[PDB]
Design a protein around this nucleic acid. Structure first.
Ligand SMILES: [Mg+2]
Ligand SMILES: [Mg+2]
Ligand SMILES: [Mg+2]
Ligand SMILES: [Mg+2]
Ligand SMILES: [Mg+2]
Length: 210
DNA sequence: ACCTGTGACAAATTGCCCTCA
DNA sequence: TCTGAGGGCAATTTGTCACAG
DNA sequence: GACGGCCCGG
DNA sequence: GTCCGGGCCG
């Protein structure tokens, strides 16, 4: 399946995207990389076959993701850009044409890489973010270990405000996304908490490949 | 005040179904 | 007939906060 | 809608 | 009987 590669600056950027939008974004990065001006395209029926959707639900996902890009911004730590500089539009039935901010090109191409089949069954977008950040530290053989700071996780993945309370962070984000990765990717993930006084400050992730 | 977990409720998202150009 | 653009749904997951200990 | 392949009239 | 361009139907 297609080999996604991306600059670590994108892996570590601060933004808020849905699952459907992240799925589309992987294909944009792939199109761009095979070369330019920044104009990309998406076909409904190919999208449907890639992610095992019907044509109808594919159409619904593309259309609403596309209208949900408006006003979205990307921050590279500290410079913010919009993803799109023109509305999406359809020249032909079943075909969408998109105008990515050409100023984003160099941020796409010290790098992270993974095959698309590794992530295409993940449902929760925060788990996609986590699996990307872990891939950034992976070894040829397939293992790695990394310590991520909680405040940096919250700022980078733009987690919602109630997850500033640690028990909610545990219950609705960490446990769910670790259990997702272990069930939906070829990765096998464990973790332990690092503390300072009563506060938990980092999470230490270890993983190997099956 | 700080920390933890759980019970509830609300809001959002998922894979469905159907209909017609 | 095959595609895809619309219009809906119920079950489930995610986001929030009161309260116990 | 868009596309193909069938069957009408001449 | 056959042959061809085109329209409609699925
Ligand atoms: Mg969908
Ligand atoms: Mg889950
Ligand atoms: Mg303290
Ligand atoms: Mg008791
Ligand atoms: Mg007390």
């Amino acid at each position: 399946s297609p080999r996604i590669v991306q600059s670590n600056d994108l892996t570590e950027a601060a933004y808020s995207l849905s699952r459907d939008q992240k799925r589309m974004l992987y294909l944009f990065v792939d199109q761009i990389r095979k070369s330019h001006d920044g104009i990309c395209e998406i076909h409904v029926a190919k999208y449907a076959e890639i992610f095992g959707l019907t044509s109808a639900e594919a159409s619904k996902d593309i259309r609403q993701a596309l209208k949900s890009f408006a006003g979205k911004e990307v921050v590279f730590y500290y410079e913010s850009f919009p993803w799109f500089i023109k509305p999406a539009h359809s020249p032909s039935r079943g075909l969408y044409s998109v105008h990515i901010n050409p100023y984003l090109i160099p941020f796409f191409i010290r790098f992270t890489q993974f095959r698309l089949s590794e992530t295409k069954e993940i449902t929760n977008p925060y788990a996609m973010r986590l699996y990307e950040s872990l891939c950034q530290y992976r070894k040829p053989d397939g293992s790695g270990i990394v310590s991520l700071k909680i405040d940096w996780i919250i700022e980078r993945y733009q987690l919602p405000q109630s997850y500033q309370r640690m028990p909610d962070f545990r219950r609705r984000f960490l446990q769910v996304c670790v259990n997702e990765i272990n069930s939906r990717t070829p990765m096998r993930l464990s973790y332990i908490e690092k503390k300072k006084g009563r506060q938990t400050t980092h999470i230490v992730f270890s993983f190997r490949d099956i």
